Amino acid sequence: NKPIVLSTWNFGLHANVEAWKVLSKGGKALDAVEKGVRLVEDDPTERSVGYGGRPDRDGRVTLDACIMDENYNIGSVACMEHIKNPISVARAVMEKTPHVMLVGDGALEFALSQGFKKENLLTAESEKEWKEWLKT
Amino acid sequence: NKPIVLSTWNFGLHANVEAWKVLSKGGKALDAVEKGVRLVEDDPTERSVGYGGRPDRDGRVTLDACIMDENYNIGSVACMEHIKNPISVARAVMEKTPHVMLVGDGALEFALSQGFKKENLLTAESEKEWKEWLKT
Amino acid sequence: TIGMIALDAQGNLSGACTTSGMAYKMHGRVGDSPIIGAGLFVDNEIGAATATGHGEEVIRTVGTHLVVELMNQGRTPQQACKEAVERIVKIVNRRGKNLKDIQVGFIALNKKGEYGAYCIQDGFNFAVHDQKGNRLETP
Amino acid sequence: TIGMIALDAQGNLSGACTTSGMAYKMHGRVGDSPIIGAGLFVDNEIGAATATGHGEEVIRTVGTHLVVELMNQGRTPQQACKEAVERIVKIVNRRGKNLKDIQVGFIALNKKGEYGAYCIQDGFNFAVHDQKGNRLETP
Fold first, then answer.
1. Rounded distance, CA C66 to CA C46, Å?
2. Is B42 in contact with B85 (CB distance < 8 Å)?
3. Alpha-carbon distance D12 to D109, whole Å?
4. Per the CB < 8 Å rule, is C56 touching B110?
5. Which of A86, B118, C54, D45 could form a disulfide with A63 if both were Cys (CB 3.0 to 4.6 A apart)?
6. Strand, helix or coil for residue D63
7. Does B106 reach chain C within 8 Å, measured CB to CB?
8. Which domains does chain D have, with CATH numbers?
9. Distance of alpha carbon C49 from alpha carbon D137, whole angstroms
10. A21 CB within 8 Å of a chain C CB
11. Is the dihedral of CA C6, A100, C104, D12 positive or negative?
């Protein structure tokens, strides 16, 4: 039974449609899973991944991601701020460096050297809610 | 065959003597492995661990460590600067937070809130060698 | 967090995992999503799996590497996910923790295009899209 | 890097792993030493293992979790370390790499106080200290 994609939670249904655009045309699983999750990182209303993501307690939106292909090539970024698409920066760690995981400032520094630019990932909604949590 | 300690590389012998001071007295394996590796973090001569460690390409000394006890309690810090003893900060992550891994600035921020001292971990020797590598 | 794994028309596996983490977490906190034996593991000879649940607990059990080795040992994706979660429950019990406070779940896929999923607690769903179309199933 | 694992007189296992990492690494690079399935894994019902070698390669194979599951499947510490490394060698050949460019090794301990170690390349040593004394052995 191939191609076939599985993803977590309800946003995974809509993510699965983007991934299937690659898979149904006989494309690589790697490009498919990357396209699939990017949809959710891109969505401001998807508050648990990328751009809509709720911040840490100090109000900084830090993102974590990793990717792994069919032949043990892997890439990860963790606690990276300002890059809406951590899965692609992770993909670039994998394909473009001798390393496999970059975290914090160094992850952003690498992202920017690869042409990703800084965006504001804290939506007004998430700043509002963080400031409600700060009272509670 | 207990107690028994194993550590990596030839410097593991001297580390093993510190760990054995705990173990021979019927001390906890957890305190023993922590005492054991701290010796090496403390030694500016052991330039692959802690103080004296060779820096990243921009000259920053960044340390990584994790600890795990007999009942799945774990603690990690990664890419942390300025704290001579990352294994104890990792131990504090384990015993003192609801989390299991802190990286970058947040790891140092936590270390300092737990009373750890901020130190300069780059030895003159390692700055010298980094500046030789920068030419080559 | 969204975790995604796939088998393409060549029969190759790959996966991706992405999150903003625990809301209002300590600064610099990292969960299971960028850790290879924990949030995501893929072996194109056996299968792939991604995790859901509390990040800390998935790190602690290296759950997704466990799921893929159980498929290696001869479990289907469904059996691997279930057996993985059942070991994790025994560990939560060994640590004297209340199971209601812990949630860990996995979705898994093997080379044949067989899939499965299982969780400690109810309330998780996952989407499956093969040639029978896109559907949301419940572990 | 120094990795250390121990069994105390109560018969409990624990371990620690610490490094400054690869010299002149990219900023923010982390290897296997802070990662639980990779640089260090301990299960008190089974055994413990710590890794040596190229951080990237240990992350990629979740090596130390593999060693402890192989001990869980009846291998002695020595057999677990060897079988783990032998799987890793088969993977770097699937990646078309040269083995001389790869180094991954493990030291392992089980609940009985039995220990073992194995590596891809020669040149690694590890220290063992039990009641008979302290000694540097070679995998």
1. 12
2. yes
3. 11
4. no
5. A86
6. helix
7. yes
8. 1-139 (3.60.20.30)
9. 38
10. no
11. positive
Interatomic CA distance for residues C105 and A100, integer angstroms = 25
Q: How was this structure determined?
A: X-ray
User: Residue D32 half-sphere exposure, CB side, CA atoms within 13 Å?
Assistant: 29
Contact B34, B67 (CB under 8 A): yes
Q: What is the separation of C-alpha A41 from the centre of its chain, rounded to a whole number of angstroms?
A: 5
Alpha carbon of A2 to those of A90, C8, C11, C12, C114: distances in Å? 26, 6, 7, 9, 9
The sign one gets for the Cα dihedral D98, D99, D104, D108 is positive
d(CA D139, CA D134): 16
Concatenating the DSSP letter of every residue in C78-131 gives HHHHHHHHHHHHHHHHHTT--GGG--EEEEEEETTS-EEEEESSS---EEEEET
- CA separation for the pair D138, C114 (Å, rounded): 44
CA dihedral (C16, C69, D32, B23) positive or negative: positive
Query: What does the DSSP assignment read for B21-69?
Result: HHHTTT--HHHHHHHHHHHHHH-TT-TTSSTTPPP-TTS---EEEEEE-
> Which residues lie below 8 Å from residue B82, measured CB to CB, with a gap of 6+?
B108, B111, B118, B119, B120, B121
Amino acid at site A119: E
CA distance C37 to C102: 19
This structure's resolution (Å) is 2.2
**At CA B125, angle to CA B122 and CA B129, rounded to 5?**
95
- Confirm if A63 and A121 have CB atoms less than 8 A apart: yes
Catalytic entry in C1, C50, C61, C64 = C1
CA atoms lying within 13 Å on the CB side of residue D86? 7
| DSSP code string of chain A | --SEEEEETTHHHHHHHHHHHHHTTT--HHHHHHHHHHHHHH-TT-TTSGGG----TTS---EEEEEE-TTS-EEEEEEE-S-S-HHHHHHHHHHHSS-SEEEHHHHHHHHHHTT--------HHHHHHHHHHTT-
Contact call for residues C59 and C35 (beta carbons, < 8 A):
yes
Alpha helices in chain D (DSSP H): 55-61, 63-72, 77-94
Q: Which of A79, A80, A105, A109 to mutate to test the interface with B (most CBs of B within 10 A)?
A: A79
Q: Tell me the longest C-alpha to C-alpha distance in chain D.
A: 46
Helix, strand, coil shares of chain B as percentages rounded to 5? 40, 15, 45
In this complex, the chains that touch C, judged by 3 or more CB pairs closer than 8 A, are A, B, D
